[PDB]
C-alpha cells in the first residue's frame, strides 16, 4: 500500500497473507469464512507451495495472535487469462478452520444487485495489504490500509493502456500518491456500509503504482458471486 495508513488493532480482520516456503508474504487474501479464503488467480503462479497466515499485522515478529493454515484445495477460475489478468480470482479451501478472534474475522459477501447499486455506488472503498510502500521499494512489514475512491468506469478506460473488462473495476487517485501495489495482489477491497464491511474487489493489477494518470485495477467480485458460492460448496 503506497501512502495509506497502518491497520490499527482489530481494523483489518479479514486480511489474509499467502506465504511461500520461506515464510515470506507474496500476496494477500480475504477471509470469507472459517474454511475459505479469496485471492487473485495470478497469485497462484507467484509460488509453488504456499500457506495462509491470518491475524498478522507486523511480520517482523510473532506476537501470539497470528495463525498459519495449510491449503487443502485451490479453486482457480478456468477462464483466468495470464495475458490480460481477466477473471483474476481464486478461492482457497483450508485444511483446518480459522479461529475467529482479535484481528481475525471474515468480510461479508454481498448479494449482486444490492452490491452494485448500494456498494459500488459508494464514494470509496478500502484496500489493504503487506505490499510495497513504493513502486520500487520492498514489501511492507506492517499491514496497511488505504481508502480509495471508486473511479468512473469510462474515466478509467480512458486512462488505461490495457483493456478494462467487465470483470474489472478501478479505484484510486489520478495524481495523489496513494494506491495498492505489488504484494497487495489478491488482497481485500472492501466497501463499508453502516459499519459493516462487504467484500467488493480483489487487488488485481495496475500500471506501476500510484502513477499520475493511472488507477489501481481490481477484479469485480460482484461478477463472480455465484462462482464464489459454488466454489464454497465444493
Amino acid at each position: 500500500i503506497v501512502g495509506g495508513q497502518e491497520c490499527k488493532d482489530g481494523e483489518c480482520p479479514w486480511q489474509a497473507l499467502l506465504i511461500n516456503e520461506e515464510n515470506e508474504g507474496f500476496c494477500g487474501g480475504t477471509i470469507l469464512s472459517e474454511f475459505y479464503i479469496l485471492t487473485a488467480a495470478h497469485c497462484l503462479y507467484q509460488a509453488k507451495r504456499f500457506k495462509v497466515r491470518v491475524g498478522d499485522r507486523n511480520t517482523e515478529q510473532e506476537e501470539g495472535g497470528e495463525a498459519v493454515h495449510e491449503v487443502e484445495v485451490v479453486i482457480k477460475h478456468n477462464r483466468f487469462t495470464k495475458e490480460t489478468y481477466d477473471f483474476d480470482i481464486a478461492v482457497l479451501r483450508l485444511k483446518t478452520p480459522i479461529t475467529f478472534r482479535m484481528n481475525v474475522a471474515p468480510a461479508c459477501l454481498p448479494e449482486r444487485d444490492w452490491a452494485e447499486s448500494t456498494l459500488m455506488t459508494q464514494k470509496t472503498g478500502i484496500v489493504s495489504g503487506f505490499g510495497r510502500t513504493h513502486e520500487k521499494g520492498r514489501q511492507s512489514t506492517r499491514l496497511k490500509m488505504l481508502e480509495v475512491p471508486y473511479v468512473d468506469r469510462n474515466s478509467c478506460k480512458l486512462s488505461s493502456s490495457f483493456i478494462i473488462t467487465q470483470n474489472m473495476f478501478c479505484a484510486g487517485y489520478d495524481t495523489k500518491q496513494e494506491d495498492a501495489c505489488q504484494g497487495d495482489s489478491g488482497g481485500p477491497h472492501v466497501t463499508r456500509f453502516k459499519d459493516t464491511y462487504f467484500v467488493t474487489g480483489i487487488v488485481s493489477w495496475g500500471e506501476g503504482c500510484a502513477r499520475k494518470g493511472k488507477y489501481g485495477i481490481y477484479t469485480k467480485v460482484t461478477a463472480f458471486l455465484k462462482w464464489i458460492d459454488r466454489s464454497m460448496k465444493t
Binding site: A107, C108, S117
Partner: protein, 51 residues
C-alpha cells in the same frame, strides 16, 4: 423504497411485490422489526474486532 436510504435496512434490501424487504448476510439474523441485522456469534462478518 430501497432507493430511499436503503429502505431503512441494515444490509441487503429487496422489493418483493413492491415495498421494502430486508435481509442479512450469513451469521446475522433479521431482527423483529425486519430491518436490523443481529450478529449470531462473537465474530460476525464485516465487523472490525474490538475483542
Amino acid at each position: 423504497l430501497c432507493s430511499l436510504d436503503n429502505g431503512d435496512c441494515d444490509q441487503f434490501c429487496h422489493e418483493e411485490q413492491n415495498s421494502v424487504v430486508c435481509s442479512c448476510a450469513r451469521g446475522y439474523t433479521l431482527a423483529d422489526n425486519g430491518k436490523a441485522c443481529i450478529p449470531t456469534g462473537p465474530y460476525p462478518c464485516g465487523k472490525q474486532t474490538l475483542e
